[PDB]
A paper describes a structure:
Matriptase is a type II transmembrane serine protease that is found on the surfaces of epithelial cells and certain cancer cells. Matriptase has been implicated in the degradation of certain extracellular matrix components as well as the activation of various cellular proteins and proteases, including hepatocyte growth factor and urokinase. Matriptase activity is down-regulated by its physiological inhibitor, hepatocyte growth factor activator inhibitor-1 (HAI-1). Sunflower trypsin inhibitor-1 ([name]), a cyclic peptide inhibitor originally isolated from sunflower seeds, exhibits potent inhibitory activity toward matriptase.
The crystal structure of β-matriptase-N164Q in complex with [name] was solved at 2.0 Å. In this structure, [name] forms a bicyclic structure where two antiparallel β-strands are constrained by a disulfide bond between Cys3 and Cys11. The cyclic peptidic inhibitor docks onto matriptase's P4-P2' specificity sites with good shape and charge complementarity. The [name] scissile bond (Lys5-Ser6) is in close proximity to the catalytic residue Ser195 where the Ser195 hydroxyl group hydrogen bonds with the main-chain amide of Ser6 and makes close contacts with the backbone carbonyl and amide of Lys5 (2.9Å and 3.0 Å respectively). The side chain oxygen atom of Ser195 is also in close contact with the carbonyl carbon of P1 residue (Lys5) (2.6 Å) at an angle of 88.6° (Lys5O-C-Ser195OG), suggesting the protease is in an active conformation capable of initiating bond scission. Furthermore, His57 is suitably oriented to interact with Ser195 to support catalysis (at 2.6 Å and with Ser195CB-OG-His57NE2 angle of 101.4°). These observations support that [name] functions as a substrate variant of matriptase in a similar manner to other BBIs. In the structure, the S2 subsite of matriptase is occupied by [name] Thr4 with Thr4 side chain flanked by His57 and Phe99. Comparing to the benzamidine-bound structure, we observed that the benzyl ring of Phe99 undergoes a rotation to widen the pocket to better accommodate the P2 residue. More importantly, the guanidinium group of Arg2 forms cation-π interactions with both phenylalanines as well as Trp215 in T-shaped geometries and provides further stabilization.
Author numbering:
A (entry chain A): 16 to 60, 60A, 60B, 60C, 60D, 60E, 60F, 60G, ...
B (entry chain I): 1 to 14
The structure:
Amino acid sequence: VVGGTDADEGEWPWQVSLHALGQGHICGASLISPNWLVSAAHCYIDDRGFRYSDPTQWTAFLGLHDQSQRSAPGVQERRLKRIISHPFFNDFTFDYDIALLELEKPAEYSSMVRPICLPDASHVFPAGKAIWVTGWGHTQYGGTGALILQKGEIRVIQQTTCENLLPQQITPRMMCVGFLSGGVDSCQGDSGGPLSSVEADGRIFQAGVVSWGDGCAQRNKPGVYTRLPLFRDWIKENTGV
Amino acid sequence: GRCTKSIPPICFPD
Ligand SMILES: *SC[C@H](NC(=O)CC[C@H](N)C(=O)O)C(=O)NCC(=O)O
């Protein structure tokens, strides 16, 4: 996260850190139930150097705050049992960039570990609505990830604006969130993490999944995210959640 | 200039 600040401990108990063998944190995810996480499909595409699609290569850290202190009280380690990438995911356009991660051992709900609400398939996060993006990604483009979990407030962007800012690159599955001036944005390492929307009752609902962008925090280049309501039914039929 | 926000990122010339 660029232009954010250190989050309070336990402020985002649904934020998950995904590590692959010998790479530490490389993607994020959101806890939606004791057995399931939501993440981005692109995180699990095989590269000719590492089998990212192999679930056994992954470790999920829940209730984590500091990447340099992963054995802290409250932190839970869980193995992955299965990875379900959306059937229509396109590894070139990044369309349908969403995945479901099944844990092997159920997560244990605590003060630091807690699921995020999922919005209904008909709900709409309006343009101009303030949203929170969180993660251990870079705090500047070309930088390093953050040891302490970072949080930043961003704005949902009009779809037509999004389409004009990133010509020929946006589909209905995607949503621009951030600021036209840049300054605050998600960055490398934030992928798969949830957008958090504080709703009318004060409860936080997931508004999207960190996906891609033309750089980080550049002017007129807001971060691009996978929409959540569109996949509410897909999530239910695959997880029961 | 499109890059996923992962590590390592998946990038394209555009
Ligand atoms: S909606 C998912 C989260 N639910 C709970 O924590 C429910 C726990 C008990 N059922 C309860 O306290 O009623 C949630 O609230 N997520 C968003 C949030 O801000 O907590």
